Design a binder for this molecule. Structure first.
Ligand SMILES: C[As](C)(=O)[O-]
Ligand SMILES: C[As](C)(=O)[O-]
Ligand SMILES: [Fe+2]
Ligand SMILES: [Fe+2]
Ligand SMILES: [Fe+2]
Ligand SMILES: [Fe+2]
Lengths: 299, 299
């Protein structure tokens, strides 16, 4: 029947396609006859899949002009060293803090190691360019990106999930590329699972600000596809509520004397399955523990 | 450590005691030197336990003057035929709709059958008086009950859980006896599980009205004890949110083609354990299915 989520590779709207894996998608925006943008930077191992899809839509790779990046996590920038060399005219648009992480050998080693863990036996990665050789340009909170005549996207700072996270708001289409700032959309239940890995105060304040946008028609997180209808319209509000709900559960359990590890293991059991293809199980469990440490400290 | 729930038989406050089983408690209010009230009507099988506790606090059973009843469900009035004969001066205070159910042989047979299922092998029920012989007086929405010099309780209609449900608000102590109108308090997670068995529109409207009470200090549902602190202060708001959350889950699952039975069985698995001592498992599962039918119809 009719559903409030579009989650299949191919055309999502007359200007928008989903490339690659719906679990870690790259979005393609048609900005004009011979101009395109990518949104979200994916995982390295998807390089040839995303390339194959891209070339179905884009006749000449020199026509890809922008690549918008929400945050520095390994699953949101892993394609950059592999596909940017094939995109001679692309400019990577990322926050200043995101750009800074790509200059840190420590940070990029973590990104590389996690991406390497996801390589399947059959596939061959193309040659990687250096992370500090990427064609990057820093974007600022509030900045207007005039990508094409019918694509004006505002950069909105949305820290909390991570210290660098931004979202991109298409004012014309009432479409928000929200990365991981709302959490992980639960494919079985239709609710947001919080992903607070840096700062709960910031995460909630970001959601407060995003709630004040004009009512959304389309909401596109970092994983799982495109949400529409009420799922888009109430996404930020719902994500805020789910974060407060997790805080309530944690506080109640702590009042009974539970260690953080009990709820962490429960969340890992309940939620880890959705991301097994792109997130090692032990890192998922560790992430749940970190989130609960943050909520406990700040709630 | 300090917890926001009191859940042990005995004194809860200087005017208030919990009698019987914390799972299906009867509350004792000291209205004066020689005047007392009971709140909530429990399950029949607890008659001698509640009697034993009552007589620890009350020197003379003729001093019990009122018995406040939230609703007609079998687990909220089962003690009445067994203990009212031992309470010569008691007046049972119930809504008109609640009183009407006790006049219906069909309705009381259901109450009797469910209560009989809960009798343990060891115990002996005292002789029951007829349901239409109970010393009942109907109370109205908005009615002020002047129970004693320091106990003024307002009757507030709170339909939705059932067609007859009311709650009792102690204006002085900012204490709400809320029956099942907020749902079932989850002992492991500290959130409300919705219990919508008649009408979702009414259930939500009741919670909207209860949210507008002065901030609560104490919130006393039909099961599980007394809540305080933020759990009391945000109870009605939280219960409203949890009902909307369940609607979201159901609607999402229905959009995927699920039958009501799938979520019903999941809820029965997740939630049925808490009430096994006083609610037959098949009735819990049936109740979950009924709730989901109502939410589907009205959401
Ligand atoms: C790697 As993640 C849980 O921030 O999408
Ligand atoms: C018997 As019931 C689930 O309304 O407390
Ligand atoms: Fe992330
Ligand atoms: Fe992510
Ligand atoms: Fe009930
Ligand atoms: Fe009940």
């Amino acid at each position: 029947g009719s559903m409030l989520r579009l989650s299949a590779p191919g055309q999502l709207d007359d200007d928008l396609c989903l490339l690659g894996d719906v679990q870690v998608p790259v979005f393609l925006l048609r900005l004009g006859e011979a101009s395109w943008a990518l949104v979200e930077g994916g995982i390295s191992r998807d390089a040839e899949l995303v390339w194959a899809d891209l070339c179905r839509w884009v006749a000449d790779p020199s026509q890809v002009h922008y690549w918008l990046i929400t945050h520095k996590h390994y699953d949101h920038c892993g394609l950059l060293p592999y596909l940017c060399p094939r995109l001679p005219n692309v400019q990577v648009l990322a926050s200043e803090r995101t750009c800074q992480a790509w200059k840190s050998e420590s940070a990029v080693r973590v990104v590389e190691r996690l991406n390497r863990q996801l390589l399947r036996a059959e596939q061959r990665l193309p040659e990687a360019c250096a992370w500090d050789a990427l064609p990057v340009r820093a974007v600022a909170d509030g900045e207007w990106l005039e990508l094409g005549p019918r694509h004006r996207l505002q950069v909105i700072e949305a820290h909390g999930h991570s210290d660098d996270h931004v979202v991109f708001y298409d004012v014309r289409r009432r479409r928000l590329f929200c990365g991981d700032a709302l959490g992980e959309f639960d494919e079985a239940e239709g609710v947001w699972r919080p992903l607070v890995f840096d700062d709960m105060e910031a995460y909630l304040e970001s959601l407060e600000r995003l709630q004040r946008l004009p009512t959304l028609l389309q909401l596109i997180p970092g994983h799982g596809g495109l949400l529409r209808g009420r799922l888009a319209a109430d996404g930020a509000e719902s994500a805020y509520t789910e974060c407060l709900r997790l805080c309530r559960r944690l506080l109640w359990r702590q009042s009974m004397g539970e260690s953080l590890d009990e709820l962490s293991e429960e969340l890992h059991r309940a939620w880890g399955g959705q991301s097994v293809d792109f997130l090692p199980g032990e890192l998922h469990l560790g992430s749940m523990r970190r989130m609960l440490e943050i909520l406990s400290r700040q709630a």
